[PDB]
Amino acid sequence: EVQLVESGGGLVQPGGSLRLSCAASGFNFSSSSIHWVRQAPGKGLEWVASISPSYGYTYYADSVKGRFTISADTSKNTAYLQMNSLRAEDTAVYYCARGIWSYWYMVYPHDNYGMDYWGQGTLVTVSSASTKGPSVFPLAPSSKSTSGGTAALGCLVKDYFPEPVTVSWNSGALTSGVHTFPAVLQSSGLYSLSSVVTVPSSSLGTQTYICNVNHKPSNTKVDKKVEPK
Amino acid sequence: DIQMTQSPSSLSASVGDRVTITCRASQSVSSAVAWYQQKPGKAPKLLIYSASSLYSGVPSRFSGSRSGTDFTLTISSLQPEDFATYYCQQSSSRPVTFGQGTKVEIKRTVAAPSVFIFPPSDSQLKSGTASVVCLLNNFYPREAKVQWKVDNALQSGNSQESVTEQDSKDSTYSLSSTLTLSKADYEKHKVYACEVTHQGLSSPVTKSFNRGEC
Amino acid sequence: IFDIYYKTLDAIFMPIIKVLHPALAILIIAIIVSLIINIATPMIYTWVPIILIFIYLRHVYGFGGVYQELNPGWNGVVVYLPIILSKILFIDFWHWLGSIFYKGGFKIVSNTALGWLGWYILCSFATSTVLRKI
């Protein structure tokens, strides 16, 4: 019955500022230490800052030192992370983590020992690129496809910014066979991804297949039905 | 500043095997070190803390050990749900530092890819741009090469491919290469073909279509 | 004067200051001087070591104390106490407090009830409390 909810992520221009909040519940916020750990896209884990409410200790990394200020409001049961002079390299998912506590803490403060619980994090993208809605184009199944085999449908989500976009088939009623490839950054600066299924050839003509694309940053929502040419 | 060098970078094991990951500290540290498991697109979870202390709920199948400055994670009998990237953290000194990461993957039998060619949609043609898609589906290992042919001419720089993470069931991969060119160049040619070279294929497979046909 | 006493005690306790919890740091220093008072037993003699103890503890955990200089933030507070701090009585604190300073004079008398000074403190405290709420 424990959890941490990060919030306040989104696209921001370089040199701006963003403020993230970590709402904790299920444990004692006044005791356990709170930690912020960011993971750059495709990279590993990085430590930003850590704080101990009540005692009020602050620990910063040399990377975010001076531009980042961590704080916690004991009365609100929340931990705040203020980001100034944001740069392009700071773009990444930001995990809020609770330190794990052993009685040796009582004799010695300042000892991490590890992170017990990690929130699913919130995405933060720093770039001057403007928001763009994605174009949804179908990938039609070939008539040459094998009779007695499986055809291949698809939806081409092209030219959208920024990430991420969620793709579902038949509104989640179609699960098996779906392959949503990782989005790739085009030279133009717009992401593009594809989504293909494997459907029985006999089902092509009679049964309907619709992909449901959603791009929250641009609010664009599209339901594209895919049928033979 | 303390640095933690974790090895290897990636490895391919099989169900029931015994995997060993090593995390070497740059200088003298306490016995306080953590090992983290992270599923794709998920938050990291705690497996071992204090180098040897197993965290609650984590099965006894996991375990840590400390040999000098070399901490090591050991999965006795690998399981299907244990496949993910594993990190090692040193919490005995600031600033806190993690490892480069270890990516563990299943090993299966060689599987030939199923190639599909997708002509650009008329809805997209009228927008002034054409994208043709080549699709490799359910193959292993990841290593595969797609060759784009337009009227028997090699294409370069206009090919972008992305490969999915290994599948949770059959443990296969899927790669997709999208050929993006202007609508003016697309209407100049008839033959559009991609050529898939793979280990599961005795001969390179070329799936192709002809522009303006059915 | 001030530097000789600071720098000398700082260099010795710095190792056990940054690492040890200030709550346990004080409790050890307090239980020790309490037993230094039972070995020696002069009260003015005993005010001398305690008053030189108070000054160094202030240099260490007071505002800008070497501790706040080592660690930023830190609201203060060397320990959080549950139930026992909420259950401790002022009347009991005063009687023990008076046991060390009254010595000779009015005997303790029954529990509850106060000398002249206790009543002046209690009423001034009760008076300043009801007027500030106005």
Q: What is the CATH number of the domain that holds B30?
A: 2.60.40.10
Contacting partners of chain B (3+ CB pairs under 8 A): A
Q: How many residues does chain A have?
A: 229
Indicate if B63 and B123 belong to the same structural domain. no
Domain range A1-128, its CATH number among 2.60.40.420, 3.20.20.70, 2.60.120.10, 2.60.40.10: 2.60.40.10
Rounded to whole angstroms, how far apart are CA atoms A99 and A108? Answer: 15
What is the distance between the alpha carbons of residues A112 and A33, in angstroms, rounded to a whole number? 9
Contact call for residues B137 and B104 (beta carbons, < 8 A): no
* Local structure of residue B100 (DSSP, 8 states): -
Residue B10 bridge partners (DSSP): B103
Structure tokens at A4: 């941490």
Distance CA A87, CA A118 (A): 25
Show residues of chain C in contact with A108, CB under 8 Å. Answer: 19-21
Domain boundaries, chain C: 2-70, 84-132
For chain A, the maximum distance between any two Cα atoms, rounded to a whole number of angstroms, is: 74
Judgement on whether residues B90 and B178 belong to the same structural domain of the protein: no
Contact B86, A109 (CB under 8 A): no
In this structure, the answer to whether residues B125 and B203 fall within a common structural domain is yes
Asked whether residue B18 falls in the same domain as residue B86, the answer is yes
Q: State the smallest CA–CA distance between residue B14 and chain A in angstroms.
A: 23
Resolution, angstroms, 1 dp: 3.5
**Which DSSP category does C22 fall into?**
H
Q: Which two tokens stand for residue A224?
A: 């594209």
Q: What backbone phi and psi angles, to 5 degrees, belong to C124?
A: -60, -35
Helix (H, G, I), strand (E, B) or coil at C50: helix
Residue A50, judged by CB atoms within 10 A of its CB (0-12, 13-18, 19+), counts as buried
**What is the C-alpha separation between C49 and A206, in angstroms, rounded?**
96
Chain A: partners with 3+ C-beta pairs within 8 Å: B, C
**Complete DSSP assignment for C72-123:** S-----S----SHHHH--HHHHHHHHHHHHT-SSS---SSS---HHHHHHHH
Question: Could you give the CA distance from residue B196 to residue B206 in angstroms, rounded to a whole number?
Answer: 6
Distance CA B85, CA B78 (A): 14
Q: Which residue from C27, C25, C24 is spatially nearest to C9, judged by alpha carbons?
A: C25
Q: Are residues B115 and B89 in the same domain?
A: no
**Gyration radius (Cα) of chain A, Å:** 23
Largest CA distance in chain B: 70
Do C and B touch, 3+ Cβ pairs within 8 Å? The answer is no
Strand pairing of A122-126 and A10-12?
Answer: parallel
Are B100 and B172 members of one domain? Answer: no
Same topology for domains A1-128 and A129-229, yes or no? yes
Give C-chain residues touching A109 at CB under 8 angstroms.
21
Q: Is A138–B46 a contact, with Cβ atoms under 8 angstroms apart?
A: no
Domain count, chain B: 2
What six digits make up the tokens of A145?
Answer: 């496809």
* Type of residue found at B170: D
> Order of strands across the sheet with B10-13?
B10-13, B102-106, B85-90, B33-38, B45-49, B53-54
* Number of CB pairs, chain A paired with chain C, less than 8 A apart: 28
Examine the fold and report which residue of B72, B90, B108 is the final residue of a domain before the chain moves on: B108
Give dist(CA C12, CA A211) in Å, integer. 71
Q: Based on the fold, state whether residues B170 and B207 are members of the same structural domain.
A: yes
Question: CB B96 to CB A47 under 8 A?
Answer: yes
Q: Per the CB < 8 Å rule, is B178 touching A194?
A: yes
Kindly state whether residues B2 and B103 are assigned to the same domain.
yes
Report yes or no: A52 at the B interface, CB cutoff 8 Å: no
In chain A, where are the structural domains located?
1-128, 129-229
H or E, element range at A179: strand A179-180
B171 lies in which domain range?
109-214
Amino acid of residue B74: T
Domain shared by B127 and B195, yes or no: yes
Taking an 8 Å cut-off on Cβ atoms, the answer to whether B118 and A193 are in contact is no
Instruction: Judge if B18 and B120 occupy the same domain.
Output: no
Residue recorded with tokens 């993006």: B180
Q: What is the CATH number of domain A129-229?
A: 2.60.40.10
Residue keyed to tokens 């969620």: A166
CB distance A70 to A5 below 8 Å = no
Q: CB neighbours of C76 closer than 8 A, spacing ≥ 6?
A: A56, C61
CA distance A210 to A223: 6
Distance separating alpha carbons of residues B167 and A180, to the nearest angstrom: 11
Cα gap C23→B97, rounded to integer Å: 29
Q: How far apart are CA A104 and CA A111, in angstroms?
A: 9
